[PDB]
């Protein structure tokens, strides 16, 4: 076609023009970069106008820790609002989820309650005709996950076993190939789908997987749908999408109208960006070497659709706060690496967008990931860890590891630390199981020490003054098969009620026609778990039984080693229960047959799940929150960082897929005197913790806080002297004024790294 | 329970009381009846004060050939509507579908694009909002069906090929047992659901048909949530259902209420009402002999049941007018039978519901079917006969075939002519398929005779000058496997669909757990097709193509057998098209495995079909109505009625399980002097025609029209003399009014048997 030979002009030559294929358009068009941050241009006046503007209703968000304004009448869809602008004079890239910002939706098709929660939570009048509309018309997700449920399962959401899954809020861990948009234009991709869609009249006719084939043509005419309304969509803003952008600023604006009708229409968890800077990199490029652009210029351009990720917003209610804390969304980005070839990743848009991290501040969102490895240009890895030291607001994936894995170098990060390879693949998202209640079950015959009712499997409780390793093993290593049974059971209701009520068509438009999918079940409270079993082990655990029997709390008399402390006598505790549950869920029947997957992550699930749990053998004393994703228990990790990032590097990604969250959190001094003793040292000590090998697989995560106990507890108490001040908490970063102040107290008594 | 023993009081025990079983129950409590009509009551004032207030209405029906009104903002559901009256304080069975009397509504589930043409075929507006709902919201099955259907399969319906399926109305074929209100009550009810839903537990988290059993479990606890609507819906009426009716005008609200929920919900073609007279019987003959109500109460009770079933309304398009003329509903009412026990299920109920037609004059609705046997008591064949030769508004089915098929005595009737297990069992409704133009495309190579385009698959039309039998045959073979392969997927399509968005709830809730499902085929136009065949096997056909070979014609040389006059050369083929066609859809695979099953029926689809259909071989002109069902074509039968109905019997109900409709009219004189001949001739004929052994299989059904030619015609010019005239047309029954100048075309040019 002439259209596309317009836009494409002077890019190089490839399967990519004839076929859908992102990876290969990078592969011979981008331009590697190995120099450093001295071509940086700073913020625009007009960047600075739009963001300070925005910052005025992100100050009222922490403040009232409520959404600024939201919907009340208006069932959202990829074209149901009009254009909305922060000021349409001074923007470069447009488009927002409605028609003002922060501004949040209403998507109902995931259920009416959590809306109806949210108006009563903010005092707001739902509108009677939505609510009619949601309840008696249109089913939801969420009403056909609880009509479906059993009451088994419903027990273990009471009792905190098996509690925060994705039955009452959109499943998130989707991304879609936005970049597709602004390299091939919507027709292109809808006259794509329209030849999968015929693909597959084939097998109908003959009867082959009737049932599978009819659901998923349907699901490729809402894709074909989907991207229609892209158009209408874009239209709105005074743009035509239907042909491929022919420039920088319209491949940006071509990629994030593509995100955009995402976060419109579905109100996913996690709604990741995907692996972009780079690829936008090659219109950058090209913009200007032709001289059509400054370099201040696309740096305004990068502010202006990073500044519109730090503006995604999704009405939530309360339940949901203190399940993901911080007002979270997840726009991850997933910046350098290194390609198969070798090259590096990295570009001059790798630099472009850390530095929105200084043109317009810190700010948790988008979350910016590093995909890092030992060969990445050292220019990078100074500027990146510079960046972390000044903003804590970057994290860190193990490239080396992961792009081997994959044997892709175009995978991405949904979320937090659950990769995936662009428009390929995905994840039926399945929060996470409170392991450590599951200990206590074996040893109280599955009686909820707090609610002293019966949820797991009745049983003889474990007897005697003292606990014995073996036994209590053996009575876990039973009831871990149970909560597999009861979280892929739960999983395989939620995911068929998603698919069916909530299908993310705008997004899975943006995918390949079979894409991969798997079942990823999350562990929380892994440390205190590993550490119970210590305790029990290698030291003496006297067990205080209430009137009827039932362990309440422990004694515990001798020390016993602690997870953090690269001790393989606990953490080879930790690497054996990841491996165990990996290996139950593994044979258990899934919905679509994806492939279940495990992480070690729990987000806020750490404070609730902890809250909802008593006394535990490790000594966790009860309501006590365990440690973020596969941390050590707070404080427990004091042998210095290269202690605790050994432990958790120990972890086997071999059986945790879907990630292995860890935060890290540093003192400046424990890193250097100076910023430049302290870049080369956090970039070593990454370079030691993602360390990879045929023998040691290395670390899979690592969020990155670099500051001082002492200024959180002073921004406790002078909250508006640091409205950005942004720090990692999970697997994600957060606002610290957006946290509560429970949310506060779990952080400011969690580890301080003080030496190396 | 003491409820159910009050209710109960003077019930015989059986199983019934411990598990749902309303065989169980009829067969230890019904009184079996072999006396005469002498006992039957007359209508009371009050009945008739309402029928004739509501006739006002049917009559602005049959002269507009429109519906009275119609909702145009409210989306019907089971509770939508407030309690309707004629006259509260005359009726003695209350419940309308609306707030009015033949005001129809509107069942968006559907598709809310015939909704909108019907608005703009009755010069009405459709709100704008549940336009939006049920565009943009809630998704329709006509969206689904048109989502995933071929451009092969759209081209067969533009072509007339496979027309008319149910694809833009609701698929109905399905029969609730409506007794089980009457019986256990809803409460007993929704606690066997609950428990039902539970049986699935296992499976489930096992991951046994993981998908299958989410599906099932889905449905159940939509049914349960119907079931509980029932309730508040009979207290909109001020009738409280939980519990069982505890006398006759109970259980026979009770019932109807059943029913009601279902024609409040679902619009299916055809919404039956099941096998009831009987059951209803238990509850009155208990009510006479305790002295409780009179016969004349007792008549007046199914006066007022059977009116509702007339006052029954659907909003239907100007295409489904064509496809199914008349304002049918099909609540069709299996009445008699024989046990498997030998006694007669005939009842004295059985005579009221027949004595209705004289209560309140002849009526197409209820479509009143007697379940014939050889072996029924002689005082009632003959007042059926009597009540036929008087309104010609019932038809028979051969009981001496079906009740030792099922090996069952519990099954009814669902719409015309297909049986099922009350409770235990239903049909994918599929319409039915134009096998004649199956043939000329055979002829033509695949290209559509009139459109002059590509149809069926792309081969070389039949050359010569004059058609060889076993070439033509050989080919037409080819073309009706390629119509079983379009037809089946077709199917699967449509009831993937109509299982998603639109799962007939309140009609499921009324079956067992597990419920057998058949894919019934229809066919169309059979003899048009056998006596084609005959012409060119026994004469000289002579085809005249046209510019391009296209045979747009035939010239026959030399008379040839025709189907109707009893001649095993034609009849011999006519059997053999319907086992051929059987024998293919057989062994292609089906949604829900539901068992492909075939009909010969029509319904309207023989004038459509015969519309889209040009010169065929057998001598029929291009445009011309098909014959009815199985009949033979108009007048080609004319060698008396015995001889027809010897032909059509030889059709086999064994590759025809969904049914095979015969319209037999007869004049008065052809059956004697007087009504006494009459009533005796026609029971012996119809006695012949059902005659049932290992050996003749017998016919299946039969529809009975016995009136004068001229009557019709004089009707025709005459219309408000008619009022009430009912007539048979194709396995239901219609006002002669109601009908369509085109359509009466129909019936006044059909064969009217002269002799026997």
């Given at each position: 076609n002439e259209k596309l030979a317009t836009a494409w002009e002077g890019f190089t030559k490839g399967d990519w023009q004839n076929e859908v294929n992102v990876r290969d358009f990078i592969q011979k068009n981008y331009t590697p970069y190995e120099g450093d941050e001295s071509f940086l241009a700073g913020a625009t006046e007009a960047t600075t106008t739009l963001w300070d503007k925005v910052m005025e209703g992100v100050k009222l968000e922490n403040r009232t820790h409520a959404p600024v304004d939201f919907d009340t009448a208006v069932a959202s869809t990829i074209t149901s609002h009009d254009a909305g602008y922060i000021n349409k004079q001074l923007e470069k890239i447009v488009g927002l989820?409605?028609?003002?910002?922060?501004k949040r939706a209403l998507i109902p098709f995931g259920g009416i309650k959590m809306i109806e929660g949210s108006c009563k939570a903010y005092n707001r009048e739902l509108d009677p005709m939505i609510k009619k509309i949601f309840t008696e018309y249109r089913k939801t997700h969420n009403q056909g996950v609880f009509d479906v449920y059993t009451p088994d399962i419903l027990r273990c959401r009471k009792s905190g076993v098996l509690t925060g899954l994705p039955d009452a809020y959109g499943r998130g861990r989707i991304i879609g190939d936005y970049r597709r948009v602004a390299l091939y234009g919507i027709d292109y991709l809808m006259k794509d789908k329209l030849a999968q869609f015929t693909s597959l009249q084939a097998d109908l006719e003959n009867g082959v997987n009737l049932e599978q084939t009819i659901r998923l043509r349907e699901e490729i005419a809402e894709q074909h749908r989907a991207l229609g309304q892209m158009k209408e969509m874009a239209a709105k803003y005074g743009y035509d999408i239907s042909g491929p952008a022919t420039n920088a600023q319209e491949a940006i604006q071509w990629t994030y109208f593509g995100y955009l009708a995402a976060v419109k229409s579905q109100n996913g968890a996690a709604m990741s960006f995907g692996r972009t800077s780079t690829f936008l990199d090659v219109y950058i490029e090209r913009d200007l070497k032709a001289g059509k652009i400054t370099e201040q210029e696309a740096q305004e351009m990068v502010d202006h659709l990073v500044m519109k990720l730090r503006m995604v917003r999704f009405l939530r209610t309360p339940e949901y706060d203190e399940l993901f804390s911080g007002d979270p969304i997840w726009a991850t980005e997933s910046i350098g690496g290194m390609g198969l070839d070798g090259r590096t990743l990295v570009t001059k848009n790798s630099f472009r967008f850390l530095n929105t991290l200084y043109t317009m501040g810190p700010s948790p969102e988008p979350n910016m990931t590093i995909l890092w490895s030992e060969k990445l240009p050292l220019n990078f890895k100074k500027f990146a860890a510079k960046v972390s030291i000044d903003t804590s607001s970057l994290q860190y994936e193990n490239d080396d590891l992961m792009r081997p894995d994959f044997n892709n170098d175009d995978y991405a990060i949904a979320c937090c630390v659950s990769p995936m390879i662009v428009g390929k693949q995905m994840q039926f998202f399945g929060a996470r199981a409170n392991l450590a209640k599951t200990m206590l079950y074996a040893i109280n015959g599955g009686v909820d020490e707090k609610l002293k009712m019966q949820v797991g499997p009745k049983s003889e409780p474990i007897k005697g003054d003292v606990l014995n390793y073996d036994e209590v093993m053996e009575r876990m290593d039973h009831f871990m098969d149970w909560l597999a049974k009861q979280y892929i059971t739960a999983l395989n209701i939620i995911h068929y009620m998603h698919d069916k009520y909530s299908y993310e068509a705008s997004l899975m438009a943006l995918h390949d026609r079979d894409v991969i999918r798997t079942m990823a079940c999350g562990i929380a409270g892994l440390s205190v778990a590993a550490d119970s079993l210590s305790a029990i082990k290698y030291a003496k655990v006297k067990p205080i039984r209430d009137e009827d029997g039932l362990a309440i709390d422990f004694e515990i008399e001798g020390e016993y080693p602690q997870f953090g402390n690269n001790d393989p006598r606990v953490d080879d505790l930790a690497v054996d229960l990841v491996e165990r549950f990996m290996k139950k869920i593994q044979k258990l029947h899934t919905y679509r047959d994806a492939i279940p997957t495990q992480s070690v992550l729990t987000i806020t699930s750490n404070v609730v799940y902890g809250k909802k749990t008593g006394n535990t053998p490790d000594g966790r004393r009860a309501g006590a929150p365990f440690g973020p994703g596969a941390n050590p228990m707070h404080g427990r990790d004091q042998k210095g960082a290269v202690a605790s990032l050994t432990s958790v590097a120990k972890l086997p990604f071999a059986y945790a897929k879907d990630g292995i969250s860890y935060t890290f959190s540093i003192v400046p001094n424990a890193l250097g005197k100076d910023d430049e003793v302290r870049k080369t040292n956090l970039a070593g000590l990454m370079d030691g913790y993602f360390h990879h090998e045929a023998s040691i697989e290395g670390g899979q995560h690592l969020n990155v806080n670099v500051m001082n106990r002492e200024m959180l507890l002073d921004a406790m108490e002078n909250p508006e002297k640091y409205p950005q001040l942004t720090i990692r908490v999970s697997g994600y970063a957060v606002?610290?004024?957006?946290?509560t102040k429970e949310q506060q107290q779990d952080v400011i008594t969690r580890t301080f790294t003080q030496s190396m």
């Amino acid at each position: 076609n002439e259209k596309l030979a317009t836009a494409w002009e002077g890019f190089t030559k490839g399967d990519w023009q004839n076929e859908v294929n992102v990876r290969d358009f990078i592969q011979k068009n981008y331009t590697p970069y190995e120099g450093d941050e001295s071509f940086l241009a700073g913020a625009t006046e007009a960047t600075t106008t739009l963001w300070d503007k925005v910052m005025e209703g992100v100050k009222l968000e922490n403040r009232t820790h409520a959404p600024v304004d939201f919907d009340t009448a208006v069932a959202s869809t990829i074209t149901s609002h009009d254009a909305g602008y922060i000021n349409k004079q001074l923007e470069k890239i447009v488009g927002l989820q409605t028609e003002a910002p922060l501004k949040r939706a209403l998507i109902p098709f995931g259920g009416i309650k959590m809306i109806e929660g949210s108006c009563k939570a903010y005092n707001r009048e739902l509108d009677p005709m939505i609510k009619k509309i949601f309840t008696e018309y249109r089913k939801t997700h969420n009403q056909g996950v609880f009509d479906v449920y059993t009451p088994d399962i419903l027990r273990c959401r009471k009792s905190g076993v098996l509690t925060g899954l994705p039955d009452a809020y959109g499943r998130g861990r989707i991304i879609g190939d936005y970049r597709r948009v602004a390299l091939y234009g919507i027709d292109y991709l809808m006259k794509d789908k329209l030849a999968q869609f015929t693909s597959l009249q084939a097998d109908l006719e003959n009867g082959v997987n009737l049932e599978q084939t009819i659901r998923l043509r349907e699901e490729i005419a809402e894709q074909h749908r989907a991207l229609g309304q892209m158009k209408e969509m874009a239209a709105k803003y005074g743009y035509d999408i239907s042909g491929p952008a022919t420039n920088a600023q319209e491949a940006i604006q071509w990629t994030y109208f593509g995100y955009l009708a995402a976060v419109k229409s579905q109100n996913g968890a996690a709604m990741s960006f995907g692996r972009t800077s780079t690829f936008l990199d090659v219109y950058i490029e090209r913009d200007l070497k032709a001289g059509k652009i400054t370099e201040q210029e696309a740096q305004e351009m990068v502010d202006h659709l990073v500044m519109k990720l730090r503006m995604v917003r999704f009405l939530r209610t309360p339940e949901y706060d203190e399940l993901f804390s911080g007002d979270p969304i997840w726009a991850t980005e997933s910046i350098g690496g290194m390609g198969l070839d070798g090259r590096t990743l990295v570009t001059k848009n790798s630099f472009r967008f850390l530095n929105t991290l200084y043109t317009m501040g810190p700010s948790p969102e988008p979350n910016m990931t590093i995909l890092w490895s030992e060969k990445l240009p050292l220019n990078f890895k100074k500027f990146a860890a510079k960046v972390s030291i000044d903003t804590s607001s970057l994290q860190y994936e193990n490239d080396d590891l992961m792009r081997p894995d994959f044997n892709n170098d175009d995978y991405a990060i949904a979320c937090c630390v659950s990769p995936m390879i662009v428009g390929k693949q995905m994840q039926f998202f399945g929060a996470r199981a409170n392991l450590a209640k599951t200990m206590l079950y074996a040893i109280n015959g599955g009686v909820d020490e707090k609610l002293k009712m019966q949820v797991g499997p009745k049983s003889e409780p474990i007897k005697g003054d003292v606990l014995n390793y073996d036994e209590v093993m053996e009575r876990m290593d039973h009831f871990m098969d149970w909560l597999a049974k009861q979280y892929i059971t739960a999983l395989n209701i939620i995911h068929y009620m998603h698919d069916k009520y909530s299908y993310e068509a705008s997004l899975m438009a943006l995918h390949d026609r079979d894409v991969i999918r798997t079942m990823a079940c999350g562990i929380a409270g892994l440390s205190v778990a590993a550490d119970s079993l210590s305790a029990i082990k290698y030291a003496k655990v006297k067990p205080i039984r209430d009137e009827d029997g039932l362990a309440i709390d422990f004694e515990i008399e001798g020390e016993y080693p602690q997870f953090g402390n690269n001790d393989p006598r606990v953490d080879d505790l930790a690497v054996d229960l990841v491996e165990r549950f990996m290996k139950k869920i593994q044979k258990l029947h899934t919905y679509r047959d994806a492939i279940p997957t495990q992480s070690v992550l729990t987000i806020t699930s750490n404070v609730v799940y902890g809250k909802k749990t008593g006394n535990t053998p490790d000594g966790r004393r009860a309501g006590a929150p365990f440690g973020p994703g596969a941390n050590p228990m707070h404080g427990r990790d004091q042998k210095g960082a290269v202690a605790s990032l050994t432990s958790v590097a120990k972890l086997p990604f071999a059986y945790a897929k879907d990630g292995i969250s860890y935060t890290f959190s540093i003192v400046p001094n424990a890193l250097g005197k100076d910023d430049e003793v302290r870049k080369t040292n956090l970039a070593g000590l990454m370079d030691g913790y993602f360390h990879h090998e045929a023998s040691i697989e290395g670390g899979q995560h690592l969020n990155v806080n670099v500051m001082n106990r002492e200024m959180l507890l002073d921004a406790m108490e002078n909250p508006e002297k640091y409205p950005q001040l942004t720090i990692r908490v999970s697997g994600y970063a957060v606002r610290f004024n957006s946290l509560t102040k429970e949310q506060q107290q779990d952080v400011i008594t969690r580890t301080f790294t003080q030496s190396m």
